[PDB]
Structure formats: C-alpha cells, structure tokens
Amino acid sequence: PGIWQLDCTHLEGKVILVAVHVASGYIEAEVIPAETGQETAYFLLKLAGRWPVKTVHTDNGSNFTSTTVKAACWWAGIKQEFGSMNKELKKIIGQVRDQAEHLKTAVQMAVFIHNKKRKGGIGGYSAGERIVDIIATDIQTKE
Amino acid sequence: VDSSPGIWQLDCTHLEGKVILVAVHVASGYIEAEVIPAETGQETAYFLLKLAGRWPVKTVHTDNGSNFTSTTVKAACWWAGIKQEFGGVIESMNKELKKIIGQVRDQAEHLKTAVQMAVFIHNKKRKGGIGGYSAGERIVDIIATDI
C-alpha cells in the first residue's frame, strides 16, 4: 500500500537509485552523480509528493543515516524499518542499452518497459496499473 | 477539468537562474516537476520518458511548439507512443507553484528541494472540503477508473 523499498546499484561507474512499490512491483529509478544523503533525501521527497509513501525499506541501512534524509522523512511523514526487480532491471537495461545515447535515458526506457510489461497469465495486469489500482482501492475504502 | 485521462500539459518556468520543468495532468490538477540547468530538447525528452513510464501518457500539450521540435524529443515521443496535443486550471498551477515555492524557499537549502516540497504540498492539498479530494487522489482515481 504505502510500503516501498529503496536501494542503489552501480552501472558504468554511475549510481542508479531504484525505488520499488513492494505490493505492485512498480519501479521508479534515477541515475545520480554518486550515493549521497542529499540525493536520497531529494529522491524521497519526489516519491512522496507522487504516491502515498509511509514506509521505506532498504538493504543498506546506512543509506538513511544522514540528517538530510531524516529531515526529509520527518517532513514528508515517512518512516523506515530498522533491520527480482533489481536483477530484472539490469537485464532490461542491457537489452535497451544500444537504443539510447546515455545510461540515464536507457534506465528510464527500461523502467518504462518494466512498468508496462503484461503478465500473460493469472491477473493479466502491469505493475503500473497495479499500483494505481491498489492506491485507488485504498482511497475508496477510507472515504 | 473537461477531459481525457492521457492528456498532460508541459512547460518551463524560470527561477534563481535555473529552469523548472512542470507537467500537469489536466484532468486532475496533479503536478510533476524537476529543476534543470536550462531548456534543452534532451531535458524535455528525458522528462517525458520518466513521465510516460509511470502514467498512461497519450498526448502532451505545450504553450510553445518549439519545445517539441527537437529531434531528441521526437525520438522519445516516438519510442514511448506519445503524440502532441493539438488545441483556467493549468494557468493557475504554474503561478500557485511559485507561490508555494516562495513560502517554503527559506525552509530549504537548494531550490530543487523547495520545488519538490511545493509539489508535495500542491498534490496533497485537499480541495472541495466535505467530500473533496487532493490532486494526487484525483489522478489515481481517474487512471484506475479507465481500466
């Protein structure tokens, strides 16, 4: 619902900040200069003003130690829990790499591919549609 | 506003020497923004690609056609399946954003931050009192309803 996972990965000497909406599989990514508290804080603010972000997990807790990140989380009302998508995204970026000049562009193309892919089978919906569905349903129940 | 879940508006506004790229989902009033060094086709195309990756973007309108004449923009639109939209809410959002940025500016180090704070404030602001909705709730509802 409002639970996300945020991590950084490296490709071509660049840092890719990847946010995953755990329940839907929806992805949002950004290529940043380097892993810094400032970038993480900035990213969280963007994510927050877009979707209802209540809790953000990570595989590297130290990512969330800076006072800029704590302040961003505090201001936006985001909490964190102390203690496929990623591997898949790298695969997609590989397939699409020769179709964009800069890694940034390729990353967004790959995010687009991921969020639009339709699971031919049970359900039959994409990650981008599922997140919108989950959030819409939640609003409806709380009205 | 009148129509279509896939219609967006895209323009650039200037502040503190930087450029603010603002996208508005016409039907809900939802905003998405980003600070960039200056207006360039590459920036615009990059933004559209991100936008298109999260929302079902069909057409995008702009008050200055030149924004979309760039070959990079055309390549991005072609790839994402977007087309230009030919022909008061939108007029308000741009100025209201600046108002919100101004009132939260000092509260932040970088302009970037102030902009995202303003976007957060705008999208979460409930309109319509009893029974009302925020732009963020509105967009999700409109998109979800369109299957």
Side-chain angles (χ1 to χ4, degrees), chain B residues 116-137:
Chain B
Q116 301 306 327
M117 284 174 95
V119 172
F120 179 106
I121 294 170
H122 173 92
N123 288 351
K124 304 294 178 179
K125 193 186 299 176
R126 173 174 261 76
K127 307 234 174 185
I130 304 175
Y133 293 97
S134 61
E137 295 175 315

Side-chain angles (χ1 to χ4, degrees), chain A residues 32-46:
Chain A
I32 53 175
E35 293 194 8
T36 68
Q38 293 284 350
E39 291 300 307
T40 301
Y42 183 59
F43 193 82
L44 287 162
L45 283 187
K46 284 196 300 180

Side-chain angles (χ1 to χ4, degrees), chain A residues 128-129 131-137 139 143, chain B residues 5 25 55-56 133 137-146:
Chain A
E129 295 178 336
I131 184 176
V132 174
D133 182 53
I134 289 170
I135 297 179
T137 300
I139 298 171
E143 280 170 3
Chain B
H25 179 250
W55 310 113
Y133 293 97
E137 295 175 315
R138 247 300 153 277
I139 189 173
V140 170
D141 175 55
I142 295 174
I143 300 304
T145 297
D146 203 269

Side-chain angles (χ1 to χ4, degrees), chain B residues 1-146:
Chain B
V1 189
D2 291 318
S3 224
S4 255
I7 302 180
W8 291 74
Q9 177 79 32
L10 184 69
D11 298 289
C12 286
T13 185
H14 311 280
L15 185 58
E16 297 185 359
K18 298 139 212 161
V19 173
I20 304 173
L21 190 42
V22 187
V24 187
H25 179 250
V26 180
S28 65
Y30 163 94
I31 295 313
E32 237 185 55
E34 261 286 18
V35 172
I36 57 181
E39 302 182 48
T40 79
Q42 289 87 334
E43 283 320 299
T44 297
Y46 184 60
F47 188 90
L48 289 167
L49 229 43
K50 289 168 58 259
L51 188 71
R54 56 177 73 99
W55 310 113
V57 177
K58 295 301 299 182
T59 53
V60 186
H61 181 272
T62 183
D63 282 342
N64 184 11
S66 69
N67 290 324
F68 298 159
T69 60
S70 139
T71 56
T72 308
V73 166
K74 299 182 169 189
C77 287
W78 166 82
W79 191 88
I82 306 170
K83 286 196 180 65
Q84 183 175 182
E85 245 305 306
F86 297 113
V89 167
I90 296 170
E91 311 167 330
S92 296
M93 268 86 227
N94 191 267
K95 248 299 182 179
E96 187 193 310
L97 194 63
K98 278 184 292 181
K99 189 197 67 170
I100 305 171
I101 295 177
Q103 53 188 232
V104 75
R105 188 59 262 258
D106 286 38
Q107 200 188 142
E109 171 95 300
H110 309 304
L111 175 60
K112 289 167 61 185
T113 315
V115 172
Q116 301 306 327
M117 284 174 95
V119 172
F120 179 106
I121 294 170
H122 173 92
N123 288 351
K124 304 294 178 179
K125 193 186 299 176
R126 173 174 261 76
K127 307 234 174 185
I130 304 175
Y133 293 97
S134 61
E137 295 175 315
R138 247 300 153 277
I139 189 173
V140 170
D141 175 55
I142 295 174
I143 300 304
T145 297
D146 203 269

Side-chain angles (χ1 to χ4, degrees), chain A residues 96-116:
Chain A
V96 170
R97 195 57 183 91
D98 52 276
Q99 288 123 263
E101 186 74 320
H102 308 115
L103 182 62
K104 289 204 311 167
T105 314
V107 172
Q108 301 308 336
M109 286 167 83
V111 165
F112 174 110
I113 296 313
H114 178 80
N115 293 336
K116 275 61 171 47

